[PDB]
Design a protein that fits this description.
Elements: E1 12-16, H1 42-52, E2 57-61, H2 66-73, H3 75-79, E3 88-90, H4 110-113, E4 131-133, E5 177-178, H5 192-199
Parallel strand pairs: 1-2, 1-3, 3-4, 4-5
Modified residues (Phosphotyrosine): 111, 157
Organism: Homo sapiens (Human)
Propeptide: 152-161
């Protein structure tokens, strides 16, 4: 319930510091639009620092491709959290839905891995809600996406477009929080990461935050708050 998360553990947040975008520039067009000139651990520490100032438990992971992310999918079962009713999953590597396998992106069925928490297959974590953050920043054109490979893309990289957008990511799973991406109102990182962290110690819920800065993709029945206590 609202303000009922009051326990020893604060919250366990995951953050993938996968800086290697060589095979991710195509699947993840948002990984070639970052700040290389000035900002080494800024773009990866900005997600961690938000939970550090709250005294939360962060799991910063290094350059781990999808093959290594499997070693995190098992940890969720090893935890077997009985009292802890708060958690957040932040993934960097996401394919364009229906694309082929990749090295830095993904080569595995995301829809199966995320389905390992179903109350009919393994009702363990289903006794509590969950949160999923997504980089909707879209700083550059996300229309890039071809079947061919890419190796030496220094400056004269690949550039293509497709007929209409492509998104089928809607599990409609109530009792959860999703940050997936008419007016021009869209989701992004633009003051979003620094505003959510400011609303954390204010005692504001996580339900009115993603839309504080439309078509908000969320489904809950109770007030999902992330207090610092």
């Amino acid at each position: 319930k609202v303000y009922q998360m009051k326990s020893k553990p604060r919250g366990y947040c995951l953050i993938i510091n996968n800086h290697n975008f060589a095979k991710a520039r195509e699947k993840v067009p948002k990984l070639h639009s970052i700040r290389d000139r000035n900002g080494t651990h800024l773009d990866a520490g900005a997600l961690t620092t938000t939970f550090e100032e709250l005294h939360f438990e962060i799991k910063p992971h290094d350059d781990c491709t999808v093959e290594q992310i499997y070693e995190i999918l098992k940890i969720y079962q090893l935890m077997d959290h009985s009292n802890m009713d708060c958690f957040i999953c932040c993934i960097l590597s996401h394919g364009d839905k229906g694309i082929i396998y990749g090295t830095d992106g993904q080569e595995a069925p995301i829809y199966e891995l995320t389905s390992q928490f179903t109350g009919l297959k393994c009702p363990s974590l289903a006794g509590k809600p969950k949160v999923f953050f997504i980089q909707a920043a879209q700083g550059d054109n996300y229309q890039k996406g071809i079947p061919v490979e890419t190796d030496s893309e220094e400056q004269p990289y690949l550039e293509m477009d497709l007929s209409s957008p492509q998104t089928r990511y809607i599990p409609d799973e109530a009792d959860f929080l999703l940050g997936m991406a008419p007016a021009e109102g869209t989701w992004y990182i633009q003051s979003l990461c620094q505003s959510l962290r400011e609303r954390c110690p204010r005692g504001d819920d996580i339900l009115t935050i993603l839309t504080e800065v439309p078509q908000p993709t969320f489904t809950l029945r109770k007030k999902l708050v992330f207090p610092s206590d």
